[PDB]
Amino acid sequence: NNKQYELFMKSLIENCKKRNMPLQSIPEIGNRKINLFYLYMLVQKFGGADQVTRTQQWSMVAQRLQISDYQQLESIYFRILLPYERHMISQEGIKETQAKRI
């Protein structure tokens, strides 16, 4: 699962580059390569950053990547790949990501 990164990564990148580089550099929070989809996989509890970015569930994300900075979290969620994260949860078009099993 060492490639799993380059996979979801390419997705996020297309966003950072399409969102006008909302970072200008990966906010490498923790002590190594970012684990966006990781702490993000936890935000799922809410599904919508803007809702989780100011709640308790955030403590889960924020406190999972040893950052304890809920603000950096939505920086992750929103400032790196808001759309993507909030995309592959509700449906994402059920014709691109999940594509109804396919």
Side-chain angles (χ1 to χ4, degrees), residues 40-97:
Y40 148 30
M41 272 333 73
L42 351 180
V43 48
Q44 214 233 22
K45 142 49 125 219
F46 238 138
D50 271 71
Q51 203 71 356
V52 84
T53 62
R54 77 229 244 201
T55 194
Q56 277 185 6
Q57 327 308 341
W58 232 196
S59 205
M60 311 177 315
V61 177
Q63 308 246 86
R64 235 256 141 69
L65 72 151
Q66 272 164 351
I67 176 51
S68 181
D69 222 46
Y70 32 81
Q71 99 94 78
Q72 265 286 24
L73 287 300
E74 201 188 23
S75 214
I76 94 141
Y77 198 143
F78 199 119
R79 293 32 181 279
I80 301 172
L81 60 174
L82 198 305
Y84 253 109
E85 329 205 335
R86 192 251 187 76
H87 239 331
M88 327 129 314
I89 4 170
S90 276
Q91 43 198 317
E92 237 259 21
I94 289 168
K95 296 295 178 132
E96 277 295 302
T97 49

